[PDB]
Amino acid sequence: SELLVNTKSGKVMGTRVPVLSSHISAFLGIPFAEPPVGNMRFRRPEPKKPWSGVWNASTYPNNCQQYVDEQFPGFSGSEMWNPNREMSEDCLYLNIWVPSPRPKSTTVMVWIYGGGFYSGSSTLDVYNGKYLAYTEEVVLVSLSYRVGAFGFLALHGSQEAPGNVGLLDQRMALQWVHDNIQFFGGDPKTVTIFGESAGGASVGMHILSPGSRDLFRRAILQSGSPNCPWASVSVAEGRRRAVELGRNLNCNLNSDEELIHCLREKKPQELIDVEWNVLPFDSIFRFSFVPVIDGEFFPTSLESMLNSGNFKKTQILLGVNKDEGSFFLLYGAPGFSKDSESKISREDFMSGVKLSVPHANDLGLDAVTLQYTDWMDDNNGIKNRDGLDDIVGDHNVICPLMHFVNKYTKFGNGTYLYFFNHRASNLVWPEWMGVIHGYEIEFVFGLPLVKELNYTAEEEALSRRIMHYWATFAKTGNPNEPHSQESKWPLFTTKEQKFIDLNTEPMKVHQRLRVQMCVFWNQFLPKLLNAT
Amino acid sequence: SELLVNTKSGKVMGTRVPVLSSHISAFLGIPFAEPPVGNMRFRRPEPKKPWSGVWNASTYPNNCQQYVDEQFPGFSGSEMWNPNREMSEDCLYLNIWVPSPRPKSTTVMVWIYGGGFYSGSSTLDVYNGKYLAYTEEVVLVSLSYRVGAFGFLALHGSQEAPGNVGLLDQRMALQWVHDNIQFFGGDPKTVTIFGESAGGASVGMHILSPGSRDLFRRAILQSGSPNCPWASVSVAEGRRRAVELGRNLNCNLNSDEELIHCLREKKPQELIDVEWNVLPFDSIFRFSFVPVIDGEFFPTSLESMLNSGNFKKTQILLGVNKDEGSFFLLYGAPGFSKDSESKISREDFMSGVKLSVPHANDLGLDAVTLQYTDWMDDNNGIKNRDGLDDIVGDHNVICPLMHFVNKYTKFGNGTYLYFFNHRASNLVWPEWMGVIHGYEIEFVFGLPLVKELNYTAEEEALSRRIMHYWATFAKTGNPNEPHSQESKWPLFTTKEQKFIDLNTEPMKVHQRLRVQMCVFWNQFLPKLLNAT
């Protein structure tokens, strides 16, 4: 039986799923760790104990416990990111889509979901692996990992809540893929990890962490990089926020043991309800429980690792969307709303700048304002709105990614950079938001191939082009088909810094992505802040 | 006799001078102070004692003792600025051009020469007042004043070398004009002071100083403003440089009395030979002996005077040239030379930035570099050369002037702003230097009306247009002829910030002159430097 697979953990039975007038096999909700429940809350994951009989892998698993977005009830633009299954702390499962007939030793791609480390689900419609697995003939895996305090509460020095456990959940799923994917017809020596936003940061973190490097071959990072300002905190800051969470829940704070015990007694929703209260600043694009620079998962600071070439040397493919900032401004900044053009007054610009760079002193804020204000036309509401989008996008996504790409490329074995700038014809969000954080994912996963979803012909073609770049890259370390006539995606090099756009128009090659602003964010501002 | 005038100081006999197929009267070398020689060196000027008989005013006076430019011997571009008469400490004289027949009560314009407070002469060919006096029917006066240490050595607290004596020379010439110009047919109630570079700064300083305000009606400032970073120093810095001059000349430094006595024994050239050695920094566009913020000539800081409206409220006309920086880069910065295109390497750019902003710390230098580097094309030699021109021009001339105009306009009675951007067809300097510091002067003084000087027809027309703006402004407080059909030079207002270009093409109105860079120079950089 094509739907029966024996693994080192036991037998699993999958399900035949229709896809684009054909079918493939899906193995959904396979456990890769023991349920991290009770006294196991906050602890490192434990390998799943093997089972007897046949694991029923016909249905999606529970999602991890998380904050749920209720800002626009019933609206598909926001609800498409929310858990679509029951939430449980029992949530460490993976999903595999397998071509039919079962392959022998094919390329494997492992998806790591984003969600700012506070949310996310492997089960979202937008992460349905069937289209990519079917079209490009890869074994497509999606893993899961604990988010929020359950994944990232960090009391450094404790073994009960050491931090980074969600990253260790991801590593354990990669370990399981390494050990077992061959039985599904996957080649464990040709595994590509790929992820978006926090999943992109996570991919970079596995590139860096000595304990993860050997578990995959190559990597794709979408709108995320390990050095993003929101993606990690120090052990002191992690400790502070954990104690502040305890304070919100009226915990005994006299020791780590007392705090952890109190926190373990709470219902999951109790933690989630006060999660946002522990942030040190009035901010946007900052999240409470995130990876911690611990000296173990990350042996030294991210900057010193990148500078010294202390990371996995392989090929990477990565890039960003045109309007990375707009999502967070909409949700978090005055003057921005879903149902208006959100033209921004000078005053709301200033408020926005302060929320966007919460760690800056007044001089730093002046620097940012000067860098992004057109002083020939400073009361232009469109320019102010677009300026803020750029500030938030450049600071949180594009410039950290550019800093990563330039550091990585000095030691790596091949870099391909993209700029995704296609606004989908059927987008439900307002026009002012442009090409939003997260909205390339639907193209990467082939949703535009589905008739009922109402994409244009050109959008289907773009999706096929992207799926083929991603999968060819996963296969070979190069997104370009050898000896094809199509226009080539050039290698990013230190010297020429080339990248391509990704849209429905003929591909163009560009150079030096947002270089002017990234010198400001990567070199000048940090120096200014360190001096003053 | 038209050439004989009786004044309160005694009788003067002038000379009939040919001008443009006609003639006018010139009274050259009239004394307005006692010779500031011997024990009077460094002291405030004394009014000239009246004389018996007839003062022979047929020939140009001596020039004040100054550093003489020998960088390009025999080259007209540089030598046109050098003294063209014998140098003497006996140099406090003025020149008057008077229409023929002698007017009754006509508009008076008083020219104050530039030269960075270290040089300058009233007698330069380029300051020949005959063309303007003849064409526009004004009484044209040019004054003189002590420069270098002779005018500006400052030992605050001493009455023997108090500082600012060159500004007091200028005021005494204005006093003489006030008291005597009526006899030459001038109206002492309608005197316009005008000057370029240090002369423009000086004009602004007379606007500010309570002791000067009553001596003139209105004012024109060309490429200079009183708040320019090179135009004044503190009393502490003036003292330091005076003592350092003494050190260079092996003076007794035990007291002001000992230092001044030593300095008074020296031949003028002895002072001049070591003048440049007292500067505190490795710099360009900085001069050794300049006006001092003394609490007397200037009652408080220039910034507090400007902020509180502590200045003469009247009409002003002022502006700048396109390439204010190039002169000083040519003379003072590596990579720049007279006979090459002076394309600038990244390395010479950095050296240039450091010379241009000598008071900045390393962070400030980084700020300037970031503000003026095109990071998409950073090795472009033309862009680097042009970037440096802008840095030097914006920092030293344009941005201080813009700061002055905006402060002044809040309290004043009418502001007219220009941007002179015509490159003269017969310019002897290289093309890379563009529209140079000082090169509007020849247009203001009507040299393009002289056939033998080889200007184009369009340049003559531009000169006539400029002379007419300047003189109509001097007459009425408005450069525009009432009820003429020509296009109007609009008033500069706080709200609309309009200015005109001045070139051979039809006049255009623009707004917000170099506003982006001037926020950097006037607001951000000073804040950065004060914090770090």
Ligand SMILES: *[C@@H]1O[C@H](CO)[C@@H](O[C@@H]2O[C@H](CO)[C@@H](O)[C@H](O)[C@H]2NC(C)=O)[C@H](O)[C@H]1NC(C)=O
């Ligand atoms: C310059 O000052 C004059 C006189 O103070 C101003 O003219 C006066 O303006 C007020 C307000 O419009 C009138 O009520 C007076 O009748 C005006 N007086 C005269 C004599 O005209 C003038 O507005 C000022 N100009 C600028 C550009 O500030």
Ligand SMILES: *[C@@H]1O[C@H](CO[C@@H]2O[C@@H](C)[C@@H](O)[C@@H](O)[C@@H]2O)[C@@H](O)[C@H](O)[C@H]1NC(C)=O
């Ligand atoms: C007035 O001066 C005229 C020009 O004088 C010249 O310069 C002075 C400084 C002397 O050096 C003199 O020898 C030069 O000729 C004379 O042409 C003119 O005669 C003088 N007039 C009177 C009445 O003295």
Ligand SMILES: *[P@](C)(=O)O[C@H](C)C(C)(C)C
């Ligand atoms: P990043 C901040 O993890 O973002 C998520 C995936 C999204 C829902 C697209 C904003």
Ligand SMILES: *[P@](C)(=O)O[C@H](C)C(C)(C)C
């Ligand atoms: P400013 C620095 O006083 O400049 C003089 C007049 C010139 C010779 C034009 C550079």
Ligand SMILES: [Cl-]
């Ligand atoms: Cl947009």
Ligand SMILES: [Cl-]
């Ligand atoms: Cl030029």
